[PDB]
């Protein structure tokens, strides 16, 4: 994620012009290789037309250029591309919203799972750790960065999200499906035990705990589903062919023709098709942004900060349910009591 | 479902070009027959114009070609097609979201329905099995693949989702409507019995069980409704006529005319209307993708994996509520306890 | 409702071509009268130009035709029509979702309202019947078909949804507003009585019953609101004028002009403006589909099956809460118990 | 609100043509003054060109007309207008959905607040009246019609929504912010008292009451927020300038030029720019509909019926919680009992 | 926020014309500097062409102008800009909806946390103050205006939202992440203590308190996430380049050419490209509105009134839970009791 929210708090004369200077997370870094390839192909074709082709070959080439310029608009680039990008962006925000955050659970846990003693601390920390473990399991399933951090379950154990006995039980479960849901079931069982022992003092609190657990587990399931049900491959293929087919056609149709031939709208050889380069910038960059966003859990500059979220959630959950449990300042009259 | 999420985790120079090489779930496999039919019809008309028609017939045909090319744009293909595809895709994701998954129920069941003995195991497994049975019934109602797997209720019994006595009661119910809802009522009754016998220890847990049951049953009902209330037939007919009428017109309007006749924008006979073939690819392929997505529970390559989901849900539910019930590792201090 | 979901489970070579053969619920049945009127008006004007008009009148008419063809595009048909159809379709699906279905209530009722005796059966059946009665009242308020089935409250009594004493109380209530909400209040009172007598064993179950009642009542209220707050009349008038004004203009602008006059793009008299007929088909058919969908509770072929839903809900609710109350097969080990 | 839902239950040959005859709530009534002003300005300019201008002035004017007709399309009317109208309509439906209806509260109140005696009736009626009072306060804050009905709090007292002692307490509260939320806090306090005295028999019912109160209060808050956070002024200004600037340009660019001058596409003087009048009708009428909808709580014909809703809610709430409290017909076997 | 909802309650002849006179929050104030820069650059280029360039240089410049006018349309300004503005506006309303308002919490607190004595008042005021403190912390994190009001936590203490002992505990917590969530955990702990001491009389009320706390905390978290996950930088850069590149091209392509040269559509030198100025107004103003809205928590005229909301919430919460706790007018018969 490349945040710039603070820099655009106010409308100002410069606008986003200062943002145009950023490299990390920028369109330029995404697209300069493709832009250079388009420009190089165009210049090679132009040089061939200017220096290699005989006069008769030049006349036929001019006919081909006029034809391609005339009929490249038959390719409905904006239609398919607008649809595709809208779908990708909608999925992008929904996937961020499905991130397995444990803040609501930590609030319920600190409010409902009681005891200053070692056993109460163990209950609170372990419930929070099961939630964090489910998050880690699903994220190493769907995020390339998290998987690199945790290539094996042994790495999960070494980071402290899972104990060795927990690891043994996890591997002993006979199931060929992804086991990210296992710590949520452990959470439900541990909550039942806490209720049975009276650490959870009432049925309503136990119910709230199970409700928030199911909300969390559903976020993990949504991440699983977004990972499994990709944007339909047909759409990705079609949009890709649309952009590439159009610019392949433009490599010919946008050639600068010999002004002495007197073709309509061809009396100026600027030698750099700067409007065509701008059009490639916009359409191919739109597609390139969709490419970055389609899997927001990779290692693009602006992909989601999944490892950061894992670390933050573990740290904040442990703080909230262990250090801050039943640790309040004195009930005092506020400044505006009178 | 043809997943490729992992392959597009990062924006890369190639883009989706590597995805262009996929066959299963690809646009090519969906559309090559129609594309070949368009090309063959076009070439037959071109050959007739080139070899069969007399000169006067050729002049009249050229007039017709110019006319059709001029006025085919009157057909608003992008308008109707954009609307139709947007509707279909929205329905597609909502239908996936309505898949009858039992994970939330299994969490509540393992947390609230107690007893290590045979009776407690029976309660937990049977509640989960009733949920899975409702899923199977609705899916064999709406999914062609699931119906092929379970052509009769006898097949449901043989797979273990329903007992023979349960089958007898199911058939004895006098109702002409789809009975997918029956196991959800069985679930409610069994939960009431569990509460009465004390297996469900509190009213809040019983309430949570009924809430999650109703959420699940509503997902099944949504699948029923999406199956019953198709995309309006008027829309499907109109969009189909739009695409076919436009390309039927293009079969004439996009013919290559004799360059010696000197018609404007007709001084080049490439003999293959490659831009028209690309346009058919895009518009007819858009329609073909809508055709794949409109019923996502069929046997297209990228239709939903309904049998896989049935098997996964049964396996995971049974594991969670039977093997993992009240089976926790020792409460131990974590790595960062200190 | 004209369902065809099963026929389009798989993408196939034919596509929706087989659907083009359907009459009931088809675009043809909606639009053939208007299409024939457009064609007849066009042919009358063409015949007048061809046979009645003098040469000078013909020249002036040709000028008028060129002018109308030139400037009919000033009318923004696709703009207003796209907006209008999007609004109508969104409302269409939301109205279907607001249908007063009693399945969730029947689940809660069978799970929480107890007694095999006559009194318990009366409680369960009467709660379900009050819900069904509220549905019937709102549907006869908003659906023309349901109102034809139940023109008076006496017809409601004769169908069994309301008793004679209930009818007397219903008429004795002094209120000029629609009384569809009355049986929901009766439901709340009857539930309170069931709780007081112990038929509802716990406060949580009573709360769940009231929650589901309020969900149901809100669906009925949403139907009332969609019926009362029509699509703004301004929009319907404007879109109607847009389509009609454009095709009125096309009746002149799309006339086939005498080819001997040599007007640009007018050297071919096909005598049937088939592209204009196709354009009327698409735009006027889009408007005609909006006309069908704007009130989905009428008697169009593809309007919602409101009487079917009323009958199904009553039958299924009675079955679920009376015949299937506390009527379970023996708790038995499943096939995969071991 | 101008309802016509019943008249369009079925698709019919006439379509919406019969709706074109309506005046109240019609586009004509909204737009005839502006349309007449456009037509008058156009005719004045035409008369000046036809009768006042010298020949040389006429030639320069013809140049200006051609220029304006050529370049008025630079103004992106459909772009900004489509966006603006979409935003306004979305807000319109959301604002209707936020109307402070008390039906859900009345159901909960009649089901949970008990006693046939005077005190129980007082509790039920006063809880409902507090909800209705909050509705009245917010509506007189946001609806011009309601404010005209209740220009002062004294008018609220005289209508019976607030007692004199309640008025004294309401004015004694020291707060410069809108006090619409005050009766909701009174509601919470009165519910707490009812629970303490046993009129609310259980904690679950008290919780449900507070939940529904918070839902209602949130609807009132949403109305407050929609009133405070207008559609951004920048958008309204920009869209207004777009429509006006375009038609100001059309006043010149759409002038009928002297046919003897032989300008291309100017050989016909119809003297009434009927296509331009139609275009003003559509674009300016779209803007005019947005003007009606942007504040749906005013006194436009099709604005929401806020006074009607206030009266209906008070009448229905009082009926439901006072006359119909614990007033049920005998539990009797229904027609299909056997 | 610049509200004008009251001024547009009714559709009127003037329309939004009176709104065109507003300066604060207007498009003019946002855009006059950029508009003046465009106009100045255009006039400098025009003066150079008119007075500095030699005849041959003038002919080449005319060729360049024709070329740029021809090909600037290749830049898809409306495509990218429409997408970008739609995304920004959606985020804008969602961010307003995530504002940390404490009204629902104050209702629950006044209804569930009891005692007229000093301790009960302390409980109610402190729970509300913790909620308000979390709001202040997140808002000083995301709003430039709030941060200016509270540059340090010491300023938070001095305003009364946090006590000195609370400040000491807040700083003693060892965490590098934003601590806005800390007072919500304090809230949960204080609620647990209130329940333990009997100030919260029942488990259901305690559950409702925790539910509303989690709703509030989630609003704060949503503000954090919208601040962190900006609109993707790629989109902002691309849209900015689109608008600037197009108008840079227009600086040349829209030059008034010498009418004696006889170029098509160039026989009129108005010397002020008023249609191009209008087009810059619309497109660049659309972008400028997106610039204002992208961070709605800054100090633009129409940014959200965050300091106002902080003050209002504190005042109203304190009033509701302290002055109005259990302070009701006598239960009296209403006007329509009979
Ligand atoms: C576009 C056609 C003419 C329109 C006429 C109106 C002008 C529209 C806005 C752009 C004006 C330049 C603003 C600028 O630049 O001044 C802003 C500000 C001043 O300085 P500061 O101290 O506030 O920082 O900030 C800076 O100058 C920061 C430096 C950032 C410069 C980045 C250059 C971008 C290249 C153009 C992109 C498009 C290429 C086709
Ligand atoms: C388009 C007009 C010119 C634009 C100029 C900029 C170039 C834009 C992106 C395309 C460049 C080719 C990339 C490529 O191809 O190299 C990527 C990579 C290298 O190799 P790797 O080892 O990373 O794998 O991956 C591969 O080459 C994998 C092989 C996949 C090749 C599939 C061929 C598709 C045919 C074109 C589709 C459009 C038809 C009209
Ligand atoms: C369109 C321009 C040329 C494109 C070239 C590619 C072809 C695109 C798809 C259409 C091909 C005909 C398929 C067909 O028709 O064969 C499918 C199938 C075979 O037979 P089956 O045993 O599978 O059944 O099903 C049937 O033939 C069922 C009979 C249904 C026929 C309905 C006729 C519709 C009239 C055209 C609509 C547009 C008018 C402008
Ligand atoms: C210019 C085209 C539209 C003009 C106006 C309508 C022309 C078609 C008249 C068809 C009347 C159907 C006869 C009938 O009343 O009986 C419908 C019967 C049962 O209905 P069902 O099959 O839904 O069950 O089914 C059938 O006879 C099959 C229904 C036949 C519909 C297919 C023909 C539509 C014409 C255009 C074809 C596509 C290119 C535009
Ligand atoms: C448009 C180009 C030609 C298209 C050819 C196809 C016709 C499309 C639909 C319109 C036909 C007239 C229907 C009509 O009018 O007959 C319907 C019906 C018959 O009578 P009924 O007893 O069912 O009632 O209802 C009435 O006639 C009620 C009277 C309402 C008349 C309102 C006149 C509107 C003026 C035109 C608007 C556009 C201006 C540019
Ligand atoms: C160029 C067209 C617009 C120019 C400006 C408005 C022209 C129409 C004036 C109609 C005034 C209605 C008289 C009235 O004040 O009394 C409305 C009365 C009750 O209203 P209600 O019927 O809703 O109940 O009803 C009626 O007299 C029936 C209402 C008549 C409205 C239909 C005529 C609209 C003109 C265009 C027709 C369509 C093509 C553009
Ligand atoms: C547009 C092409 C011709 C269309 C012909 C139809 C007219 C469309 C609506 C505009 C007419 C002027 C209304 C007006 O102005 O009268 C309204 C009203 C009268 O006075 P009142 O006592 O109700 O206040 O309110 C005022 O006059 C308040 C004064 C506000 C004046 C602001 C001037 C804006 C400049 C034009 C914007 C576009 C520039 C390209
Ligand atoms: Ca990525
Ligand atoms: Ca399919
Ligand atoms: Ca209908
Ligand atoms: Ca209004
Ligand atoms: Ca801002
Ligand atoms: Cl609850």
Author numbering:
A (entry chain A), B (entry chain E), C (entry chain D), D (entry chain C), E (entry chain B): 2 to 339
Give the authors' words:
Bestrophin-1 (Best1) and bestrophin-2 (Best2) are two members of the bestrophin family of calcium (Ca2+)-activated chloride (Cl−) channels with critical involvement in ocular physiology and direct pathological relevance. The bestrophins are a family of Ca2+-activated anion channels consisting of four members (Best1–4) in mammals. The overall architecture of hBest1 and hBest2 resembles the pentameric assembly previously shown by KpBest, cBest1 and bBest2, and retains the two landmark permeation constrictions, the neck and aperture, in the ion conducting pathway. Ample electrophysiological evidence indicates that the neck and aperture serve as dual Ca2+-dependent channel “gates”, as disrupting either of them partially impairs Ca2+-dependence while disrupting both makes the channel completely Ca2+-independent.
To further investigate the structural significance of the AS, we generated hBest11–345 and bBest21–345, and solved their structures in the presence of 5 mM Ca2+ at 2.4 Å and 1.9 Å, respectively. Remarkably, both structures exhibited 100% of particles with a fully open neck, in sharp contrast to the only ~10% particles with partially or fully open neck in WT hBest1 and hBest2, respectively. Previously, we found that bBest21–406 conducts similar Cl− currents to those from the full-length bBest212, suggesting an insignificant role of the residues after position 406 in channel gating. Remarkably, removing the AS from hBest1 and hBest2 results in truncation mutants that both exhibit a fully open neck in 100% of Ca2+-bound particles in cryo-EM and conduct indistinguishable and significantly elevated currents in patch clamp, while swapping the AS between hBest1 and hBest2 results in chimeric mutants with exchanged channel activities.
